[PDB]
RNA sequence: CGCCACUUCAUGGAAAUAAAUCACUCACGAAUGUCUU
């Protein structure tokens, strides 16, 4: 009945359009945070996607998300949606197809956000993540780092930024932290993550428009890689317990897939919303 | 005039060389520029 953390875990490519005026080759760019330039989803897009999924359940939509745009009478929604910040991203590797890349700065920002928002299971996650971050800083000692926690993953190569994965044996990764951040997790410096998540390294796809075999238009598209993880905060205010429980159970159902992003018909931005499990 | 055979069985040179290494076209088009209480 308070602020809750949700994880997105996109199962496909995701393209949430900024609508910004492009200065380069990529016509369609993805939404990025103003301050940190990390990929993000606007709260309006999150609310739109979740309302689209639940649109059939009219009472739940009216109670939680509010009235329709054409409704003759307006009811404010009881649920407040926040921005979805990038948690982890898949990066190309050599021993494995990919690794889930996280940075120290995004971990610190997540800790600050949970402290500021006071999530449901905030305390244990804050304590364990703070201990992990302090151990990481103790082992790094001001140097650029890339730490794997699976012993088999030692010596892994991040392809885009040519760095090698080290294994600190005295830094334990708790199972809940693995469930939150992902499997085959790599913790590296935020400079490496910023380079990996910048415009020159995010996947760019060429697209065509053909009329009777003649190309009408050409443009390039930017997408967020599949299996990337994003987190947002949901504030319910104080909604009906039955509608809120229905919303949480439907969201956490393994068979529930939410479409966030532009290209729905060609399978862009299908995700599985998770809840912060108790530690 | 008679009688009678042995010997030798591939070396040297050339073992790739130039020309073209992407060209032209499309590089966003249409809708929405606020709407409902």
mmCIF file of C-alpha atoms (C1' of nucleotides) in Angstrom:
data_model
loop_
_atom_site.group_PDB
_atom_site.id
_atom_site.type_symbol
_atom_site.label_atom_id
_atom_site.label_comp_id
_atom_site.label_asym_id
_atom_site.label_seq_id
_atom_site.Cartn_x
_atom_site.Cartn_y
_atom_site.Cartn_z
ATOM 1 C CA UNK A 1 0.000 0.000 0.000
ATOM 2 C CA UNK A 2 3.024 2.235 -0.585
ATOM 3 C CA UNK A 3 5.743 2.909 -3.155
ATOM 4 C CA UNK A 4 6.829 -0.270 -4.942
ATOM 5 C CA UNK A 5 9.716 -1.111 -7.262
ATOM 6 C CA UNK A 6 9.005 -2.877 -10.554
ATOM 7 C CA UNK A 7 11.439 -4.422 -13.047
ATOM 8 C CA UNK A 8 10.605 -4.434 -16.751
ATOM 9 C CA UNK A 9 12.851 -7.111 -18.337
ATOM 10 C CA UNK A 10 12.103 -6.543 -22.012
ATOM 11 C CA UNK A 11 11.830 -9.793 -23.978
ATOM 12 C CA UNK A 12 12.451 -8.138 -27.366
ATOM 13 C CA UNK A 13 13.842 -4.983 -28.944
ATOM 14 C CA UNK A 14 12.308 -1.834 -27.464
ATOM 15 C CA UNK A 15 11.856 1.544 -29.165
ATOM 16 C CA UNK A 16 10.156 4.276 -27.135
ATOM 17 C CA UNK A 17 10.300 7.343 -29.345
ATOM 18 C CA UNK A 18 11.524 10.694 -28.079
ATOM 19 C CA UNK A 19 10.072 12.696 -30.942
ATOM 20 C CA UNK A 20 13.246 14.783 -30.818
ATOM 21 C CA UNK A 21 14.725 16.525 -33.847
ATOM 22 C CA UNK A 22 17.585 14.339 -35.050
ATOM 23 C CA UNK A 23 20.867 15.820 -36.257
ATOM 24 C CA UNK A 24 22.392 12.585 -37.569
ATOM 25 C CA UNK A 25 21.591 9.447 -39.545
ATOM 26 C CA UNK A 26 19.168 7.921 -37.015
ATOM 27 C CA UNK A 27 15.703 9.368 -37.624
ATOM 28 C CA UNK A 28 13.984 7.530 -34.749
ATOM 29 C CA UNK A 29 15.848 7.778 -31.439
ATOM 30 C CA UNK A 30 14.861 6.263 -28.110
ATOM 31 C CA UNK A 31 13.978 8.173 -24.960
ATOM 32 C CA UNK A 32 16.946 9.114 -22.778
ATOM 33 C CA UNK A 33 17.235 10.806 -19.404
ATOM 34 C CA UNK A 34 17.997 14.518 -19.588
ATOM 35 C CA UNK A 35 20.679 14.471 -16.881
ATOM 36 C CA UNK A 36 22.440 11.097 -17.171
ATOM 37 C CA UNK A 37 21.630 10.375 -20.865
ATOM 38 C CA UNK A 38 20.753 6.786 -19.983
ATOM 39 C CA UNK A 39 17.821 5.196 -21.844
ATOM 40 C CA UNK A 40 14.521 5.695 -20.055
ATOM 41 C CA UNK A 41 10.760 5.410 -20.481
ATOM 42 C CA UNK A 42 8.515 8.376 -19.778
ATOM 43 C CA UNK A 43 5.868 7.753 -17.133
ATOM 44 C CA UNK A 44 3.194 8.626 -19.699
ATOM 45 C CA UNK A 45 4.331 5.737 -21.894
ATOM 46 C CA UNK A 46 4.374 3.307 -18.969
ATOM 47 C CA UNK A 47 0.870 4.356 -17.940
ATOM 48 C CA UNK A 48 -0.349 4.076 -21.525
ATOM 49 C CA UNK A 49 1.062 0.575 -21.977
ATOM 50 C CA UNK A 50 -0.274 -0.721 -18.660
ATOM 51 C CA UNK A 51 -3.684 0.859 -19.303
ATOM 52 C CA UNK A 52 -3.727 -0.722 -22.765
ATOM 53 C CA UNK A 53 -3.099 -4.144 -21.232
ATOM 54 C CA UNK A 54 -5.837 -3.695 -18.611
ATOM 55 C CA UNK A 55 -8.224 -1.783 -20.904
ATOM 56 C CA UNK A 56 -10.638 -4.735 -20.988
ATOM 57 C CA UNK A 57 -11.024 -4.572 -17.186
ATOM 58 C CA UNK A 58 -12.979 -1.319 -17.161
ATOM 59 C CA UNK A 59 -13.445 -1.050 -13.388
ATOM 60 C CA UNK A 60 -9.749 -1.629 -12.675
ATOM 61 C CA UNK A 61 -8.728 0.988 -15.252
ATOM 62 C CA UNK A 62 -11.196 3.525 -13.867
ATOM 63 C CA UNK A 63 -10.096 2.925 -10.273
ATOM 64 C CA UNK A 64 -6.329 2.868 -10.824
ATOM 65 C CA UNK A 65 -5.553 4.778 -14.029
ATOM 66 C CA UNK A 66 -8.597 7.062 -14.121
ATOM 67 C CA UNK A 67 -11.082 8.139 -16.778
ATOM 68 C CA UNK A 68 -10.835 7.729 -20.534
ATOM 69 C CA UNK A 69 -9.911 10.792 -22.631
ATOM 70 C CA UNK A 70 -13.477 10.981 -24.017
ATOM 71 C CA UNK A 71 -15.191 10.294 -20.677
ATOM 72 C CA UNK A 72 -18.019 12.734 -19.965
ATOM 73 C CA UNK A 73 -16.807 12.978 -16.352
ATOM 74 C CA UNK A 74 -13.205 12.997 -15.142
ATOM 75 C CA UNK A 75 -11.802 10.930 -12.273
ATOM 76 C CA UNK A 76 -8.140 11.370 -11.266
ATOM 77 C CA UNK A 77 -6.181 8.141 -11.252
ATOM 78 C CA UNK A 78 -5.109 6.877 -7.850
ATOM 79 C CA UNK A 79 -1.890 5.302 -9.172
ATOM 80 C CA UNK A 80 1.132 7.499 -9.924
ATOM 81 C CA UNK A 81 3.657 6.160 -12.437
ATOM 82 C CA UNK A 82 7.304 7.228 -12.405
ATOM 83 C CA UNK A 83 10.160 7.095 -14.898
ATOM 84 C CA UNK A 84 11.682 3.759 -15.900
ATOM 85 C CA UNK A 85 15.463 4.008 -15.621
ATOM 86 C CA UNK A 86 17.865 1.539 -17.190
ATOM 87 C CA UNK A 87 19.016 -1.094 -14.697
ATOM 88 C CA UNK A 88 21.029 -3.569 -16.780
ATOM 89 C CA UNK A 89 21.843 -4.006 -20.456
ATOM 90 C CA UNK A 90 23.169 -7.002 -22.414
ATOM 91 C CA UNK A 91 26.659 -6.544 -23.849
ATOM 92 C CA UNK A 92 28.440 -8.758 -26.356
ATOM 93 C CA UNK A 93 30.811 -11.343 -24.878
ATOM 94 C CA UNK A 94 33.060 -14.153 -26.107
ATOM 95 C CA UNK A 95 32.716 -17.010 -23.604
ATOM 96 C CA UNK A 96 28.944 -16.423 -23.488
ATOM 97 C CA UNK A 97 26.569 -14.865 -26.038
ATOM 98 C CA UNK A 98 26.055 -11.845 -23.779
ATOM 99 C CA UNK A 99 26.460 -10.514 -20.251
ATOM 100 C CA UNK A 100 24.120 -8.273 -18.263
ATOM 101 C CA UNK A 101 26.084 -5.063 -17.737
ATOM 102 C CA UNK A 102 25.558 -2.869 -14.679
ATOM 103 C CA UNK A 103 27.632 0.073 -13.485
ATOM 104 C CA UNK A 104 28.552 1.384 -10.054
ATOM 105 C CA UNK A 105 26.862 4.736 -10.705
ATOM 106 C CA UNK A 106 23.515 3.174 -11.614
ATOM 107 C CA UNK A 107 23.749 0.994 -8.493
ATOM 108 C CA UNK A 108 24.354 4.092 -6.360
ATOM 109 C CA UNK A 109 21.484 5.905 -8.088
ATOM 110 C CA UNK A 110 19.236 2.906 -7.413
ATOM 111 C CA UNK A 111 20.236 2.925 -3.737
ATOM 112 C CA UNK A 112 19.521 6.659 -3.532
ATOM 113 C CA UNK A 113 16.155 6.176 -5.252
ATOM 114 C CA UNK A 114 15.085 3.386 -2.889
ATOM 115 C CA UNK A 115 16.152 5.479 0.108
ATOM 116 C CA UNK A 116 14.274 8.490 -1.281
ATOM 117 C CA UNK A 117 11.148 6.538 -2.263
ATOM 118 C CA UNK A 118 11.123 4.032 0.646
ATOM 119 C CA UNK A 119 10.117 0.982 -1.362
ATOM 120 C CA UNK A 120 8.376 -1.984 0.253
ATOM 121 C CA UNK A 121 11.489 -4.184 0.583
ATOM 122 C CA UNK A 122 13.906 -1.261 0.468
ATOM 123 C CA UNK A 123 15.925 -1.836 3.643
ATOM 124 C CA UNK A 124 17.470 -5.263 3.010
ATOM 125 C CA UNK A 125 18.258 -4.428 -0.614
ATOM 126 C CA UNK A 126 19.850 -1.135 0.448
ATOM 127 C CA UNK A 127 22.023 -2.865 3.045
ATOM 128 C CA UNK A 128 23.191 -5.685 0.771
ATOM 129 C CA UNK A 129 23.715 -3.439 -2.265
ATOM 130 C CA UNK A 130 25.679 -0.980 -0.117
ATOM 131 C CA UNK A 131 27.908 -3.784 1.171
ATOM 132 C CA UNK A 132 28.423 -5.037 -2.394
ATOM 133 C CA UNK A 133 29.243 -1.530 -3.645
ATOM 134 C CA UNK A 134 31.692 -0.943 -0.791
ATOM 135 C CA UNK A 135 33.413 -4.261 -1.530
ATOM 136 C CA UNK A 136 33.567 -3.294 -5.216
ATOM 137 C CA UNK A 137 35.157 0.056 -4.353
ATOM 138 C CA UNK A 138 37.603 -1.634 -1.970
ATOM 139 C CA UNK A 139 38.694 -4.090 -4.668
ATOM 140 C CA UNK A 140 38.847 -1.511 -7.476
ATOM 141 C CA UNK A 141 40.879 1.117 -5.575
ATOM 142 C CA UNK A 142 40.256 3.869 -8.103
ATOM 143 C CA UNK A 143 40.918 1.721 -11.184
ATOM 144 C CA UNK A 144 38.634 0.761 -14.048
ATOM 145 C CA UNK A 145 37.002 -2.548 -13.172
ATOM 146 C CA UNK A 146 34.868 -5.298 -14.684
ATOM 147 C CA UNK A 147 33.869 -7.942 -12.136
ATOM 148 C CA UNK A 148 32.132 -11.245 -12.845
ATOM 149 C CA UNK A 149 30.778 -13.378 -10.015
ATOM 150 C CA UNK A 150 30.400 -16.728 -11.763
ATOM 151 C CA UNK A 151 33.843 -18.404 -11.602
ATOM 152 C CA UNK A 152 33.358 -19.789 -15.121
ATOM 153 C CA UNK A 153 32.935 -16.228 -16.441
ATOM 154 C CA UNK A 154 36.431 -15.088 -15.437
ATOM 155 C CA UNK A 155 38.389 -13.806 -18.409
ATOM 156 C CA UNK A 156 35.260 -12.893 -20.363
ATOM 157 C CA UNK A 157 35.696 -10.189 -22.996
ATOM 158 C CA UNK A 158 33.319 -7.266 -23.429
ATOM 159 C CA UNK A 159 33.592 -6.780 -27.171
ATOM 160 C CA UNK A 160 32.619 -3.141 -27.755
ATOM 161 C CA UNK A 161 34.919 -1.764 -25.045
ATOM 162 C CA UNK A 162 37.891 -4.132 -25.124
ATOM 163 C CA UNK A 163 38.105 -4.942 -21.418
ATOM 164 C CA UNK A 164 38.406 -8.257 -19.599
ATOM 165 C CA UNK A 165 36.236 -9.540 -16.759
ATOM 166 C CA UNK A 166 37.937 -10.179 -13.415
ATOM 167 C CA UNK A 167 36.602 -12.412 -10.636
ATOM 168 C CA UNK A 168 36.883 -11.120 -7.044
ATOM 169 C CA UNK A 169 36.410 -14.239 -4.941
ATOM 170 C CA UNK A 170 35.694 -12.324 -1.706
ATOM 171 C CA UNK A 171 32.651 -10.413 -3.013
ATOM 172 C CA UNK A 172 29.520 -12.578 -2.586
ATOM 173 C CA UNK A 173 26.560 -11.947 -4.891
ATOM 174 C CA UNK A 174 23.419 -12.859 -2.974
ATOM 175 C CA UNK A 175 20.731 -14.832 -4.854
ATOM 176 C CA UNK A 176 18.198 -12.002 -4.551
ATOM 177 C CA UNK A 177 20.705 -9.568 -6.060
ATOM 178 C CA UNK A 178 21.116 -12.020 -8.946
ATOM 179 C CA UNK A 179 17.332 -12.176 -9.359
ATOM 180 C CA UNK A 180 17.194 -8.371 -9.466
ATOM 181 C CA UNK A 181 20.192 -7.578 -11.682
ATOM 182 C CA UNK A 182 20.178 -10.689 -13.889
ATOM 183 C CA UNK A 183 22.217 -13.779 -14.646
ATOM 184 C CA UNK A 184 25.818 -13.559 -15.866
ATOM 185 C CA UNK A 185 26.077 -10.121 -14.284
ATOM 186 C CA UNK A 186 29.019 -7.818 -14.992
ATOM 187 C CA UNK A 187 29.693 -4.777 -12.810
ATOM 188 C CA UNK A 188 31.950 -2.245 -14.529
ATOM 189 C CA UNK A 189 32.826 1.439 -14.414
ATOM 190 C CA UNK A 190 30.143 3.872 -15.522
ATOM 191 C CA UNK A 191 32.370 5.113 -18.353
ATOM 192 C CA UNK A 192 32.231 1.661 -19.958
ATOM 193 C CA UNK A 193 28.457 1.492 -19.458
ATOM 194 C CA UNK A 194 27.986 4.976 -20.929
ATOM 195 C CA UNK A 195 30.054 4.024 -23.974
ATOM 196 C CA UNK A 196 28.098 0.775 -24.348
ATOM 197 C CA UNK A 197 24.720 2.532 -24.016
ATOM 198 C CA UNK A 198 25.502 5.564 -26.196
ATOM 199 C CA UNK A 199 24.049 6.294 -29.633
ATOM 200 C CA UNK A 200 27.022 4.824 -31.521
ATOM 201 C CA UNK A 201 26.726 1.462 -29.729
ATOM 202 C CA UNK A 202 22.971 0.976 -29.381
ATOM 203 C CA UNK A 203 21.590 -1.243 -32.175
ATOM 204 C CA UNK A 204 20.690 0.701 -35.320
ATOM 205 C CA UNK A 205 18.478 -0.931 -37.946
ATOM 206 C CA UNK A 206 17.905 0.100 -41.553
ATOM 207 C CA UNK A 207 14.305 0.082 -42.763
ATOM 208 C CA UNK A 208 12.688 0.316 -46.185
ATOM 209 C CA UNK A 209 9.423 1.187 -47.922
ATOM 210 C CA UNK A 210 8.920 -0.678 -51.206
ATOM 211 C CA UNK A 211 6.328 0.187 -53.868
ATOM 212 C CA UNK A 212 6.145 -2.427 -56.645
ATOM 213 C CA UNK A 213 9.804 -3.218 -56.023
ATOM 214 C CA UNK A 214 10.809 0.464 -55.953
ATOM 215 C CA UNK A 215 12.133 1.926 -52.707
ATOM 216 C CA UNK A 216 9.939 4.833 -51.610
ATOM 217 C CA UNK A 217 11.592 5.846 -48.325
ATOM 218 C CA UNK A 218 14.626 4.949 -46.230
ATOM 219 C CA UNK A 219 15.309 5.619 -42.555
ATOM 220 C CA UNK A 220 17.240 4.184 -39.620
ATOM 221 C CA UNK A 221 15.880 3.199 -36.216
ATOM 222 C CA UNK A 222 17.372 2.994 -32.727
ATOM 223 C CA UNK A 223 16.239 0.258 -30.338
ATOM 224 C CA UNK A 224 16.994 -0.898 -26.805
ATOM 225 C CA UNK A 225 18.529 -4.401 -26.859
ATOM 226 C CA UNK A 226 16.454 -7.408 -25.864
ATOM 227 C CA UNK A 227 16.793 -8.701 -22.260
ATOM 228 C CA UNK A 228 17.598 -5.198 -20.998
ATOM 229 C CA UNK A 229 16.241 -4.462 -17.527
ATOM 230 C CA UNK A 230 14.568 -1.236 -16.405
ATOM 231 C CA UNK A 231 13.098 -0.228 -13.053
ATOM 232 C CA UNK A 232 10.360 2.244 -12.158
ATOM 233 C CA UNK A 233 8.391 3.252 -9.069
ATOM 234 C CA UNK A 234 4.631 2.796 -8.732
ATOM 235 C CA UNK A 235 2.714 4.814 -6.143
ATOM 236 C CA UNK A 236 -0.828 3.588 -5.533
ATOM 237 C CA UNK A 237 -1.940 6.347 -3.180
ATOM 238 C CA UNK A 238 -4.637 4.292 -1.475
ATOM 239 C CA UNK A 239 -6.632 2.240 -3.974
ATOM 240 C CA UNK A 240 -9.174 -0.507 -3.406
ATOM 241 C CA UNK A 241 -7.381 -3.554 -2.034
ATOM 242 C CA UNK A 242 -9.205 -5.843 -4.472
ATOM 243 C CA UNK A 243 -8.333 -3.797 -7.567
ATOM 244 C CA UNK A 244 -4.747 -3.277 -6.398
ATOM 245 C CA UNK A 245 -4.321 -6.991 -5.672
ATOM 246 C CA UNK A 246 -5.777 -7.853 -9.082
ATOM 247 C CA UNK A 247 -3.351 -5.413 -10.718
ATOM 248 C CA UNK A 248 -0.325 -6.822 -8.880
ATOM 249 C CA UNK A 249 -1.275 -10.455 -9.513
ATOM 250 C CA UNK A 250 -1.917 -9.839 -13.216
ATOM 251 C CA UNK A 251 1.366 -7.930 -13.522
ATOM 252 C CA UNK A 252 3.371 -10.631 -11.723
ATOM 253 C CA UNK A 253 1.744 -13.491 -13.648
ATOM 254 C CA UNK A 254 4.427 -15.281 -15.722
ATOM 255 C CA UNK A 255 2.050 -15.439 -18.713
ATOM 256 C CA UNK A 256 1.528 -11.654 -18.804
ATOM 257 C CA UNK A 257 3.417 -9.677 -21.464
ATOM 258 C CA UNK A 258 3.213 -5.880 -21.758
ATOM 259 C CA UNK A 259 3.978 -3.949 -24.954
ATOM 260 C CA UNK A 260 5.941 -0.750 -24.280
ATOM 261 C CA UNK A 261 7.337 1.063 -27.295
ATOM 262 C CA UNK A 262 6.421 2.022 -30.829
ATOM 263 C CA UNK A 263 6.466 -0.926 -33.226
ATOM 264 C CA UNK A 264 3.843 -3.238 -31.755
ATOM 265 C CA UNK A 265 3.048 -5.166 -34.940
ATOM 266 C CA UNK A 266 6.677 -6.170 -35.532
ATOM 267 C CA UNK A 267 7.153 -7.143 -31.901
ATOM 268 C CA UNK A 268 9.037 -4.184 -30.424
ATOM 269 C CA UNK A 269 9.044 -3.731 -26.665
ATOM 270 C CA UNK A 270 7.337 -6.772 -25.161
ATOM 271 C CA UNK A 271 8.250 -7.019 -21.480
ATOM 272 C CA UNK A 272 7.486 -8.900 -18.262
ATOM 273 C CA UNK A 273 6.917 -6.658 -15.245
ATOM 274 C CA UNK A 274 8.343 -8.029 -11.995
ATOM 275 C CA UNK A 275 7.954 -6.927 -8.384
ATOM 276 C CA UNK A 276 10.663 -6.417 -5.775
ATOM 277 C CA UNK A 277 10.739 -9.800 -4.064
ATOM 278 C CA UNK A 278 11.503 -9.932 -0.326
ATOM 279 C CA UNK A 279 15.185 -10.405 0.441
ATOM 280 C "C1'" C B 1 85.477 -64.993 -94.517
ATOM 281 C "C1'" G B 2 84.187 -66.777 -89.825
ATOM 282 C "C1'" C B 3 82.513 -65.433 -84.906
ATOM 283 C "C1'" C B 4 80.801 -61.714 -81.407
ATOM 284 C "C1'" A B 5 77.979 -57.059 -78.366
ATOM 285 C "C1'" C B 6 78.179 -53.450 -74.694
ATOM 286 C "C1'" U B 7 76.726 -48.104 -72.914
ATOM 287 C "C1'" U B 8 73.301 -43.995 -71.905
ATOM 288 C "C1'" C B 9 66.962 -43.257 -69.863
ATOM 289 C "C1'" A B 10 66.004 -35.068 -67.347
ATOM 290 C "C1'" U B 11 68.181 -31.529 -66.121
ATOM 291 C "C1'" G B 12 68.017 -26.034 -65.861
ATOM 292 C "C1'" G B 13 64.102 -21.570 -66.235
ATOM 293 C "C1'" A B 14 59.109 -19.552 -65.610
ATOM 294 C "C1'" A B 15 55.172 -21.545 -60.322
ATOM 295 C "C1'" A B 16 51.038 -16.336 -61.332
ATOM 296 C "C1'" U B 17 50.893 -11.000 -63.346
ATOM 297 C "C1'" A B 18 47.827 -6.326 -64.144
ATOM 298 C "C1'" A B 19 42.456 -3.843 -64.396
ATOM 299 C "C1'" A B 20 38.107 -3.078 -61.789
ATOM 300 C "C1'" U B 21 37.385 -3.112 -54.706
ATOM 301 C "C1'" C B 22 31.079 -1.350 -55.120
ATOM 302 C "C1'" A B 23 28.293 2.113 -58.466
ATOM 303 C "C1'" C B 24 23.088 4.736 -58.968
ATOM 304 C "C1'" U B 25 18.381 5.599 -56.523
ATOM 305 C "C1'" C B 26 15.653 6.381 -52.275
ATOM 306 C "C1'" A B 27 18.365 9.360 -46.540
ATOM 307 C "C1'" C B 28 12.248 9.516 -44.177
ATOM 308 C "C1'" G B 29 6.761 10.046 -46.780
ATOM 309 C "C1'" A B 30 1.413 10.665 -44.821
ATOM 310 C "C1'" A B 31 -1.859 11.697 -40.224
ATOM 311 C "C1'" U B 32 -2.024 14.461 -35.543
ATOM 312 C "C1'" G B 33 -0.011 21.089 -34.265
ATOM 313 C "C1'" U B 34 -4.133 19.778 -29.370
ATOM 314 C "C1'" C B 35 -8.695 17.008 -27.813
ATOM 315 C "C1'" U B 36 -12.624 15.537 -23.808
ATOM 316 C "C1'" U B 37 -14.594 17.085 -18.920
#
